[PDB]
């Protein structure tokens, strides 16, 4: 598969989202699914297209597995790669840090030469601050199973549909 999806999860929500995304793209022949806990930063070198999934924890912090590999990202050559992002979060309980992890990873990875694709509009959400917002759009798909579980299915479908174009599909 030409697309590599790497996710991190604490309670399993980001994993479920990741599995749905793979399914929407067309299955394992289209998208390789990997838990970042079982990977090396160098594993990211193999793809032209990447999808990064990471939930935010403990007030604007990266999920533990992403935190662990964070300093190793500098060794990956992101030049020429197109990267999309997604994350699970809680806009009500953490309105001042909603989807912060997604924003932290995007800032790092994009500064290393990659091009971010898959921006998502902020309509329908209610939050105060987020490090994942640029030009009034999220840098990736913001899922909220804690407060908006009924919107998830459609959010994934629409986002994947828009992504296909960007990933030469």
Cβ-based burial of 70 (10 A; exposed 0-12, middle 13-18, buried ≥19): middle
- Which of 5, 9, 50, 119 binds ligand FMN (CB under 6 A)? It is 9
Query: DSSP H helical segments within the chain, as ranges?
Result: 13-25, 64-69, 100-111, 152-166
Is residue 132 near ligand FMN by the rule CB under 6 A? Answer: no
Residues 6+ apart with CB under 8 A from 78: 44, 109, 110, 112, 113, 114
| Contact region with ligand FMN (CB under 6 A), list: 30-38, 42-50, 96-104, 111-119 | 96-104
| Contact region with ligand FMN (CB under 6 A), list: 10-18, 30-38, 64-72, 108-116 | 10-18
- Which of 76, 100, 103, 163 binds ligand FMN (CB under 6 A)? It is 100
DSSP assigned state of 150: G
Report the residue number, 91 or 114, with the smaller CB distance to ligand FMN. 91
Please choose, from the candidates 151, 99, 98, 84, the residue with its C-alpha nearest in 3D space to the C-alpha of residue 124.
Answer: 151
- The pair of structure tokens assigned to 11 is 């309670």
CA-to-CA dists, residue 8 to 1, 40, 106, 130, angstroms: 20, 13, 15, 19
Is residue 99 near ligand FMN by the rule CB under 6 A? Answer: yes
Residues numbered 43-82 forming contacts with ligand FMN, rule: CB under 6 A: 55-60, 63
Please choose, from the candidates 85, 120, 89, the residue with its C-alpha nearest in 3D space to the C-alpha of residue 105.
Answer: 85
By Cβ distance, which residue is nearest to ligand FMN? 89
Report the residue number, 26 or 35, with the smaller CB distance to ligand FMN. 35
| Contact region with ligand FMN (CB under 6 A), list: 12-20, 69-77, 107-115, 149-157 | 12-20
Enumerate binding residues for ligand FMN (CB under 6 A): 9-14, 55-60, 63, 88-90, 94, 97-100, 145-146
């Amino acid at each position: 598969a030409k697309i590599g999806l790497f996710y991190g999860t604490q309670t399993g929500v980001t994993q479920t989202i990741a599995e749905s995304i793979q399914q929407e793209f067309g299955g394992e022949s289209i998208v390789d699914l990997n838990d970042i806990a079982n990977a090396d930063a160098s594993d990211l070198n193999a793809y032209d297209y990447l999808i990064i999934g990471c939930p935010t924890w403990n007030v604007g912090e990266l999920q533990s597995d992403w935190e662990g590999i964070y300093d190793d990202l500098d060794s990956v050559n992101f030049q020429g790669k197109k990267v999309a992002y997604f994350g699970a979060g809680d806009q009500v309980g953490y309105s001042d840090n909603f989807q912060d992890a997604m924003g932290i990873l995007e800032e790092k990875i994009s500064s290393l030469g990659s091009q971010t694709v898959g921006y998502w509009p902020i309509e329908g959400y209610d939050f105060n601050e987020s490090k994942a917002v640029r030009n009034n759009q999220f840098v990736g798909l913001a899922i909220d199973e804690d407060n908006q579980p009924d919107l998830t299915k459609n959010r994934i479908k629409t986002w994947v549909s828009q992504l296909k174009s960007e990933f030469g599909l």
